[PDB]
Structure 1
Amino acid sequence: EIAPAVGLSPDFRNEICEAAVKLCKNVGYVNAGTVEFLVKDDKFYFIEVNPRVQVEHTITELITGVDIVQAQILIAQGKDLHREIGLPAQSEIPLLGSAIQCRITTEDPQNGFLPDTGKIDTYRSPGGFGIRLDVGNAYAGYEVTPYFDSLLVKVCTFANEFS
């Protein structure tokens, strides 16, 4: 997943964002949520709303500076986005570079993406400028079981330029 949609024009992206807002205004949407569209040749079509946070929220936090999960919790406490949580008006919402998220899993791509299981012997996580990690279950000694998803760690990168 990437953010923003760097391959589409900023006018067109903005039109998509307004359509999502219009829908949410109409129903009085509260808390975090996402509006999903399919896009084809400068037209766009609504497909679903996910009325919760999503796995890929991380990249939006990085290009806006906004902490979405904190925001969810503060909204649920009855707070005002602008007044108490501190978000600016729409036109002032930052747009800082771009960001990309990959999920690193035990899915084996040479075995039909079947998720591997067993013990983790070694786990060394990188860092530096432009790197964000949100770990799942991965640490030296951890036994990956077959009962849940195969996610080890989510990696995001961010920078001024997409490249």
Structure 2
Amino acid sequence: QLGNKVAARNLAISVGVPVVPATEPLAEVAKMAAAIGYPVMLKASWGGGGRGMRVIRSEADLAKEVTEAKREAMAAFGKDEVYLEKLVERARHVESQILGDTHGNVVHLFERDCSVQRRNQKVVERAPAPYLSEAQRQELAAYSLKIAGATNYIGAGTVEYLMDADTGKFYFIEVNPRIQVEHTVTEVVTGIDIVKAQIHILDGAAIGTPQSGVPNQEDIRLNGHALQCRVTTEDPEHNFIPDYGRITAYRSASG
């Protein structure tokens, strides 16, 4: 339901959560793309690895590009389904963290900003999204609970959205039905162990009880701010090519 992006998007349309205008799956794209309008972002349905995407600015580009986009999606993801989505030209990436149990309770652990991106891959993530109003933040929290309730969501997953910088509108983009690399920032500002929750949950536990590791929605409270960086061997002075071999000395910093 959430694996395929079109099916996921259709899910959200069905429970009243906003989306960007997107086509059906794709040898005559526009007509179709032309109904959406340019510019558009081409996205692999299924497989969403922080990118097999492509911005198409005009019809003359379409033929080479969709084809290429397809050979790649088959390459990287192995399923080959692409659809066109209307491009949000100026965008912030915000996302809701949700926990659902085997008994139908679902809670949000507020949002993260992950707009710090390198060609659509997440680089720096922050909790809460610093530039949000208390009401926008409640607006998002409520969509993600409608998305989770809808799929009787069991465990941890993430609901991701594009904020349109020009209007401050939200548009559901995808679900990740899994823990994420950036979960950690949500953990330190809420005090809630997401992994222990995962396990308590499939043990059959009820969210809101001590043995679930998860508070009732009303006792889930934001405390400060946090951000996460990933240290890699990608060498800034050598085209970010990943270095490797032996680490001979290593001292990380705490406190």
TM-score range, shorter chain: 0.7 to 0.9
- Is 1:22 aligned to 2:132, yes or no? no
TM-score (norm 2): 0.49
What do the CA deviations read for 1:83-128 (whole angstroms, capped 9, x no partner)? 2325332232110000010000001122221101111011001111
Which residue matches 2:245?
A: 118
SS of 2:155's equivalent? coil
- Is 1:48 aligned to 2:174, yes or no? yes
Q: How many Å separate the matches in 2 of 1:109 and 1:46?
A: 34
Amino acid at match of 1:3: A
Query: Aligned-pair RMSD on alpha carbons?
Result: 1.1
Q: How many Å separate the matches in 2 of 1:17 and 1:112?
A: 40
2:224 to 97, 102, 105: 97
Amino acid at match of 2:195: V
Which residue matches 2:4?
A: none
Q: How many Å separate the matches in 1 of 2:163 and 2:130?
A: 14
Which residue matches 2:205?
A: 79
Specify the structure having the higher radius of gyration (Cα): 2
Query: For the Cα contact (< 8 Å) 2:197–2:214, is it kept in 1?
Result: no
Q: Return the offset for 1:42.
A: 1.6
Query: For the Cα contact (< 8 Å) 2:160–2:175, is it kept in 1?
Result: yes
Q: How does 1:120-159 map to 2 (within 5 A)?
A: 120-128=247-255
Q: How many Å separate the matches in 1 of 2:161 and 2:207?
A: 25
TM-score (norm 1): 0.75
Query: For the Cα contact (< 8 Å) 2:234–2:241, is it kept in 1?
Result: yes
Which residue matches 1:159?
A: none
Amino acid at match of 2:201: I
Q: How many Å separate the matches in 2 of 1:58 and 1:99?
A: 9
| Greater RCO (Cα-Cα under 8 Å, separation 6 or more) | 1
Which residue matches 2:135?
A: 11
Q: How many Å separate the matches in 2 of 1:9 and 1:87?
A: 25
Bigger helix share? 2
Q: How many Å separate the matches in 2 of 1:91 and 1:103?
A: 32
Which residue matches 1:63?
A: 189
Amino acid at match of 2:135: D
- Identical counterparts, % of pairs: 52
SS of 1:47's equivalent? strand
Larger deviation: 45-54 or 109-118? 109-118
Q: How many Å separate the matches in 2 of 1:54 and 1:86?
A: 19
* Structure 1 gap ranges (5+): 129-163
SS of 1:105's equivalent? coil
